[PDB]
Structure formats: C-alpha cells, structure tokens
C-alpha cells in the first residue's frame, strides 16, 4: 500500500485444490490491482479455470485473458476481474521539519 512499485505473487500446485482457488480469489478481491501484474493475473485465472472447469494447465496454456474470462463466466464464476485501490491523501505535520 505504501509503495506502488512493489508487487504480489503466488505459486499454486499442479493440481489446484479448493484452497488454491480460495487464495486466488482473496488476492483479486482485497489486493490492489496495481500490485497484481498481467502475468500473475493470467495465472490466477488459469488456476481458477483448472479447478472450476474440467481442464488441466497444459490445455489452458496459450489462452488469452479474455478467453479465460469467458470460460469462467459461462461456468458461473463472476470473480474474473481485478479491482483498483483508492488513493488516500496523506500529510505529515511540519513540526521542526518542513513537512511532507
């Protein structure tokens, strides 16, 4: 939250379980979209597709984000998008220093 340049990543198992999907959806909901990269976004979509839809990682490889979103929406999964975080405007009182 303090530094925009930092990022959040994950690594799931070859066969995702219900916890892997739970972890993936918790990140896309309650973490800044500026922290999750495009490549991490596709991986989070892929691990959800492998569990919710009957498919393996090799099949969903070379699949674009739009195709993965269509696959999950048809199955009935609505959590397929990233959410941006609002910027809170902060000031530090000067005291002896000039202030920031």
């Amino acid at each position: 939250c303090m530094f925009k340049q930092f990022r959040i990543g994950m690594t799931y198992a070859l066969d995702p379980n219900i916890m892997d999907v739970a972890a993936a959806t918790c990140m896309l909901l309650f973490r800044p979209a500026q922290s999750i990269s495009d490549e991490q976004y596709r991986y989070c979509l892929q691990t959800m597709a492998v569990f919710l839809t009957n498919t393996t990682y090799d099949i969903v490889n070379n699949d674009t984000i739009d195709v993965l979103k269509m696959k999950l929406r048809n199955q009935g999964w609505p959590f397929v998008e990233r959410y941006n975080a609002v910027e809170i405007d902060m000031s530090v009182e000067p005291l002896r220093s000039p202030g920031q």
């Binding site: 809170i88 405007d89 902060m90 000031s91």
Partner: protein, 201 residues
C-alpha cells in the same frame, strides 16, 4: 484524507467504550443478533454504527427528547441562573460605573448590563486567549476592560450584616506561561450609608 480516517476511528472507539461502560446502552437482544456470526458484542455494535452514518432514517421525537432540548436551550439562553456568564468587567475603584441599586448592596458587583461607554468612550473588550498572552497587562488594567470569548463560573454569598464587599481571592494570577483569572467568589454585604469606617475601607 488520513486525518479524517484517524479522527473517525478514534472518536468511534471512544463512543463504544463509553456506551458499553457501566450499564450498556444496548439490550441483550440486539447483542445476540449482532454476535450470531461469532464476533464479540463490542465489535458487532461497532460495525453497525459505521453503516448507519449518513442515514436518512426518520426518528420519532419522544417526549423526553423535547424535555432535554427545552432545558438545554434555557441553559444557554439564561446563563446567570446556573452560575456562569459570558463576560466580566475589571475596573479600577476610582472609575464610577453604573450598577444595580435595587438590592441595597454595598459596592454592588452587579450591573443591569455591562456599560457600553464609560466617560464618553466605549469600554475596551479583550478575548480571554489574547488576555492570557498579554505581557503589557499592567498598562491595560489601568484603564479597564471587558473580558469575553469565554465562560466564567462564579458564586456569591450574600451576608446579612454590613461589611466590605470583596472577592475571596485575587482577581488575576500572572505567570511566565500566560495569565489567568482566579475563581470568582463574592462576599456581598448590605449597605448602611452612614458608616464612615466601611466607606473609607
């Protein structure tokens, strides 16, 4: 803004702590509803209060609301009934001010209204905060002024006998870190006009 969020969080905790202290304001029936998920009673009430902020729900005005509102209005409007006033006047003895003479008090400290003009000139008015920071107070009190922008608590004891009407303590205290007005307590005495001793005092 970070300031608004910090202010909201601190004020909310103060309300919750005060509400749940001694006898709780909220009955046990509402606590059971708010603790169904598993959160504690304090936490469940705290989240509900946050949601209600900005509500447009109409709330009916019960009779005890009106009674307290009526008393609160009279508290502000008629301050002298309850022992506090909004302004005071400090004058030297040699300056003659018009005072209330209905009660037959010797050197009555009461006036019908604080004078707008004395000796043809408007009385200087100084706010308490400005007066506290004044370092030339010795020159100012020579002429006389009116202290305002503060609430002054005062008490008086009416004495049946005759004597010098004086304050219990000194008027002001002068320190390095500002000035202040000491607590006001009046010893008011009834007046015999032909007592030369008490007149000279």
């Amino acid at each position: 803004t970070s300031g608004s969020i910090i202010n909201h969080a601190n004020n909310l905790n103060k309300v919750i702590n005060h509400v749940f202290a001694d006898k709780p304001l909220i009955s046990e029936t509402m606590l059971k509803i708010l603790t169904i998920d598993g959160t504690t009673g304090k936490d469940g009430y705290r989240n509900w209060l946050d949601k209600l902020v900005g509500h447009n729900y109409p709330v009916y005005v019960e009779p005890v609301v009106n009674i307290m509102n009526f008393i609160s209005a009279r508290f502000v409007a008629d301050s002298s009934y309850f022992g506090y006033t909004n302004e005071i006047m400090i004058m030297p003895n040699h300056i003659n001010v018009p005072v209330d003479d209905r009660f037959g008090f010797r050197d009555s400290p009461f006036c019908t209204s604080l004078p707008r003009t004395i000796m043809g000139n408007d009385v200087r008015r100084i706010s308490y905060n400005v007066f506290s920071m004044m370092e030339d107070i010795d020159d100012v009190i020579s002429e006389g002024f009116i202290l305002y922008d503060a609430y002054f608590n005062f008490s008086y004891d009416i004495m049946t006998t005759d004597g010098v009407t004086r304050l219990k303590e000194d008027i002001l205290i002068v320190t390095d870190t500002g000035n202040d007005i000491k607590p006001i307590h009046f010893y008011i005495y009834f007046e015999n006009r032909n007592d030369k001793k008490l007149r000279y005092e």
